[PDB]
């Protein structure tokens, strides 16, 4: 079946690095994109960053960049996040989204966010 | 880039009875190809969010008969036509229209 | 460090430009093929035989059309082995046809250079050769159109498509096709048209330049295609690098070039109707 499973919840230190894992299931990896979105207690859905499990092309939001990367890793199907300089505004839930699709003749944006993860609670302290 | 409003901000509804949320986009939400790339999501509290409807009125699989969706151009509603006791959660929508794309404000239904 | 570009995609040029171009281009091939293969097999020479088995390549391309059309306009409503299936045969007639013109080639040279003593080995490779030369290697070269071509679901639109890894199998495969469809025949029949012309330089002309003009005419079609291609692939090397608008450019130039280069399934029926036979 279709699914993605995320690392477990974890405490941070400010000014450390965290490193959240996606690893994905039930479906061909290289075919789609992964988007990586946070929401933080008492607020909105923010979206974060995307990144292509095809020819690794990303794109990270502008509030957030300078201080996240994107990876992925095809031989075992998983994606990560690396986020540093972290503050006490970043304490949220990550979650982790299938977005987009990306084939030979076919590199679209606008299909996706069917099937997320369970998300991991990251808090600065 | 493009924010989304939604309404009301707390629905108190009772049991039996339809529950309306609407939100409204900063631009028109009509792609090239002449598609509008709305959808609406679902979170019950302590899990991942949960789609209803997508392309503004096409249910996903597995949702009920209850949910349907409406609206065109700039301005887009949900409708639960019988409250029942499991709607109790959060109520999203998300366009996928400009990259990248952007969330609603959240509307909580109060059973 | 790479930011994305994706496609875009419009109502007005794909949904409605490229479906009658299709149809157009099928019902011109497919009564074309259909009367010349019933003239050619139910009433000759080589050149003939040879242009009976470019119709019957022609024909798998014209069955072929009705899928890509439909996919176009509507969706991709015919599963998963169909996909592979169209994808196989798509491969096989692109590949086969170019073979067999240089088959043509080497058979005017050994006709016109030699004429002497040329009836036997004419004979032995028209009968023998072809099938073990052009349908075989057309056969074995889709190997990675059975293993990549695949459908995939995406919201509730289903997608035939080749999924590969990465971005690199496309410029591999993407060389591999302009090299075995452009230089090695194009080699081959540059070739024995220059020793031929040399030969007859102090010097017939009824079937040679019938010949030359048809895989002139072939090989007119094909070159926008394969100088699209060629800047594609240069462009995902990264050796050319200049935007993203240019990106969007080259590919409805490819698409569009992809639809002129679709005509050459009717260059036989039209130099059949046209120069008489
Ligand atoms: C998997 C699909 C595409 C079949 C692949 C094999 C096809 C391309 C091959 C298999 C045997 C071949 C046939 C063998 C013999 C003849 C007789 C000749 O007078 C005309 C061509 C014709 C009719 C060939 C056409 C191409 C052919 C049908």
Redesign the interface.
Known sequence: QVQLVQSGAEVKKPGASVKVSCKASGY?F??YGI?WVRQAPGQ????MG?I?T??????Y?QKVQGRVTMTTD?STSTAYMDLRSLRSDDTAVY?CAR?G?T????????????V????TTVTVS | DVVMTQSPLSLPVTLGQPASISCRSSQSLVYTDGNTYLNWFQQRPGQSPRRLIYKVSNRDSGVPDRFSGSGSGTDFTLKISRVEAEDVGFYYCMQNTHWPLTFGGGTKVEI | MKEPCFREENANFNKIFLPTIYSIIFLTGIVGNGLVILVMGYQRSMTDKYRLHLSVADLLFVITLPFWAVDAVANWYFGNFLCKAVHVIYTVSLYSSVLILAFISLDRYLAIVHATNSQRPRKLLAEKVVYVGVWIPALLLTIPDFIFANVSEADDRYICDRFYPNDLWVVVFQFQHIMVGLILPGIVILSCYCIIISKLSHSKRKALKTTVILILAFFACWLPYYIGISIDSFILLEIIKQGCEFENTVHKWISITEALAFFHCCLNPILYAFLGA
């Open positions: 061909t290289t075919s988007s909105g859905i923010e979206w995307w292509s095809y020819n690794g092309n990303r794109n939001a095809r979650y977005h699709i084939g030979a003749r076919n590199y679209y944006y606008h299909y996706g966010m069917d997320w993860g369970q998300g």
